[PDB]
Design a protein around this ligand. Sequence first.
Ligand SMILES: Nc1ncnc2c1ncn2[C@@H]1O[C@H](COP(=O)(O)O)[C@@H](O)[C@H]1O
Length: 408
Amino acid sequence: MVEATGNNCPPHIESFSDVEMGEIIMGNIELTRYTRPTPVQKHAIPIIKEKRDLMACAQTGSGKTAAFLLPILSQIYSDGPGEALRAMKENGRYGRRKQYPISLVLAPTRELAVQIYEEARKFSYRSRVRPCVVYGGADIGQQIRDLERGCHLLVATPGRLVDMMERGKIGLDFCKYLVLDEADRMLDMGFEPQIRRIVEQDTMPPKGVRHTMMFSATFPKEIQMLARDFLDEYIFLAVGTSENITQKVVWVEESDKRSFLLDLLNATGKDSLTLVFVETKKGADSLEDFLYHEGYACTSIHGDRSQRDREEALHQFRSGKSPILVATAVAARGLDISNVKHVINFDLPSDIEEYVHRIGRTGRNLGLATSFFNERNINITKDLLDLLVEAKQEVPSWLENMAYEHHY
Ligand SMILES: Nc1ncnc2c1ncn2[C@@H]1O[C@H](COP(=O)(O)O)[C@@H](O)[C@H]1O
């Protein structure tokens, strides 16, 4: 889970439409095919939309890039500087030869800057904002020519940005959004003097005028001290498994799933915790009852359970008194369940996205996900095949077969 702490902290959201980001952003989100905000996004988006400074301890895989880009671009579209007044300000003797970014994102490496820039383009599509990216280790002439086409949003490595500033190619006078991404890694690389020259020693509006966000995977003292210097009345956001997981997919008819489950639980040793996902609340109650009467210590959680029922279930699971948890996915979202050795998709979900999040509960090191598949699940065939192949897992032969069927 995610915790956010500070004075008057805006509450989190559940979906992108919970804040009014406008039609350009919302249409771009549909093109990007994000369906719901990740945990860091759920917190960071309303924080940024409310114009609050943010210190976020979060890493890659978080969705931290869109967590900052979405609300920043949204604000620029909603209430960015007036076009014509701004052109008067930026038009020199030779035309627009120096650019004045509304938003600056600092990043440690060319590879990270480029990723942030590519995500920005996904969200700046059909808007007035042209993002741009500059980085060390590549021809500067080329970058300067590109800046001249427009950077309302500039992504940059710190050394190359200082170079651009010294050359008079970039002005920070109107820069209203500053993001430091992987701030820890930037300090590790010795960029702090460059960052201080960018932020404190030139023309960037000071904290409380500009809006500032910092992201790092770690939070040492030096980062807390940078946050204190750079951030005004900020909120502290702390976020609490990829290929550590063996994935088994087996063909199981509905009337066979309980028996198949028993065999899986019989092969379980130790105190290994098992998470069993089912489709429905009824399904959860019914399966927990079957297991109890079969002599298994298990518990269950779903949406119609009280907060007390839920706390009691988690207590037994976490002590390992009842080392099998039966859950609907909607019920498991948000609660802390880590040391799961085995995730069982007793029923598969309709979307491969939900599949990925479910199996992400095991091996945060060794982990196992076993999924029961039948005719009800034809619709995820190709996406599941793509996922298995990508993770270098065993692909059932019948799955590759079904994947290419044009007759059934
Ligand atoms: N709401 C979302 N839904 C699905 N994928 C996302 C979402 N937000 C970010 N991502 C993806 O998550 C991955 C890691 O993002 P990041 O942590 O921003 O490096 C990238 O592939 C993003 O495109």
